[PDB]
């Protein structure tokens, strides 16, 4: 199911390169460094942002916009988050710009889709598990990913993969 | 499942503020004394709705821009419909502008989440009945909102909620 | 399911109506001698292709923009695949242009929507047969279109419907 849809525009010449210190995360800014179009990077990046923060719905609640990271992997902008912000285990962003940039957030739950490896017993008395993997065992859980992060290594478990999320 | 997509761009400056008595509906033009940025939120409610006739695929087929109205629920515009469009039960909405207003609109058909309150044994010989809760029993329906709230009403039934849809 | 979402920005006037030598199709050939705004037309082309291969995540793998083709039923913009992109069986896209134009397109996968003309025990060894009805059988499958189709025309069988893609 769709969680939540974001869309922000912003002109890119309006937007002063002196903000990349306020709104870019560490991984970011290690990015924005390999970066040509710097002024385009960080309009860019605040579109994304933005954007993600309209999917929500609540807005900043008691965030940062350094609380979300949108990395890359191949060309595709991907979101990394640092924070709680919900129990969606999908984001599908896309960016384009031409003077204009426009950004696209939409977050989504997909059932299953969260990889965990650990001991089966310890698993099945607390989650729903569906399938078993190399990676380890896919279950299904309504819990955000720093909560479920912080259940499991108190324990010998350990969170694989968050759908297509990034954490930390 | 998604039902439909639906984005729209226009220029601000190019859009009259004296299309606010053909577009707006009632609510809107309450909301419209409140607002600041007079321009913004004609070209803002222009372009959502617009969006969300492209979302329905048949564009305006008996309908009117008075018919959607967008409406404000924190900072988040919010679908409300005064006619029956679809059986979709979820309108996802974001709007941004910075000189253009980009608005997009995403029709979502999910099972359940359409709350009605009343006598249970009514609601089984009709409707595929899901869940109890305090805002009343959560039914799966294919029917549109306003069918829906007519063949309620006719009896000692009432619509509580249909999806995140406001009606009327 | 969400598999991808694409969106693009392009200044209209800034596209050469040269270009669409280079990026249409030969339906689109078509419905370009029959557009009165040849330069929007041209300019939208370009966007929704942007927008599509954003969407896929991989961008041209092997790909050109003439193996996908935009084409229009009643007033809406219709994806028509001449190659596998995958395995989602629809493509919710819209358009719009005001000097800039935007274009939008969100991939999903839907259980089942796949129909299908043959015989029902061939079909049940291969396939999850859902639903009969007077288009066809339809069935669950994640074979790309192109894929199946040769499958089925190698027997007595024919694809009917992909979802909302248009094949060849």
Same mark, same amino acid.
């Given at each position: 199911?769709?969680?939540?849809?974001?869309?922000?525009?912003?002109?890119?010449?309006?937007v002063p390169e002196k903000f990349a210190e306020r709104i870019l995360g560490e991984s970011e800014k290690r990015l924005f460094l390999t970066r040509?179009?710097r002024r385009?990077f960080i309009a860019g990046r605040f579109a994304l942002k933005?954007?993600?923060?309209?999917?929500?719905?609540?807005?900043?609640?008691?965030?940062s916009f350094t609380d979300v990271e949108f990395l890359?992997?191949?060309? =595709?902008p991907?979101?990394c *988050?640092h924070? $709680?912000?919900? @129990?969606?285990?999908?984001?599908?962003?896309? +960016?384009?710009?031409?003077?204009?940039?426009?950004?696209?957030?939409?977050?989504?739950?997909? =059932?299953?889709?969260?990889? *965990?490896?650990? $001991?089966?017993? @310890?698993?099945?008395?607390?989650?729903?598990? +569906?399938?078993?993997?190399?990676?380890?065992?896919?279950?299904?859980?309504?819990?955000?990913?720093?909560?479920?992060?912080?259940?499991?290594?108190?324990?010998?478990?350990?969170?694989?993969?968050?759908?297509?999320?990034?954490?930390?």
């Open positions: 199911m769709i969680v939540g849809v974001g869309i922000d525009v912003l002109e890119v010449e309006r040509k179009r385009e933005e954007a993600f923060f309209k999917a929500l719905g609540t807005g900043l609640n008691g965030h890359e992997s191949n060309g =595709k991907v979101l *988050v924070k $709680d912000f919900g @129990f969606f285990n999908y984001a599908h962003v896309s +960016l384009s710009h031409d003077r204009f940039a426009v950004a696209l957030v939409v977050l989504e739950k997909r =059932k299953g889709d969260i990889i *965990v490896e650990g $001991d089966e017993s @310890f698993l099945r008395k607390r989650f729903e598990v +569906l399938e078993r993997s190399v990676e380890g065992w896919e279950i299904e859980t309504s819990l955000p990913p720093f909560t479920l992060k912080k259940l499991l290594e108190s324990s010998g478990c350990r969170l694989v993969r968050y759908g297509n999320i990034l954490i930390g």
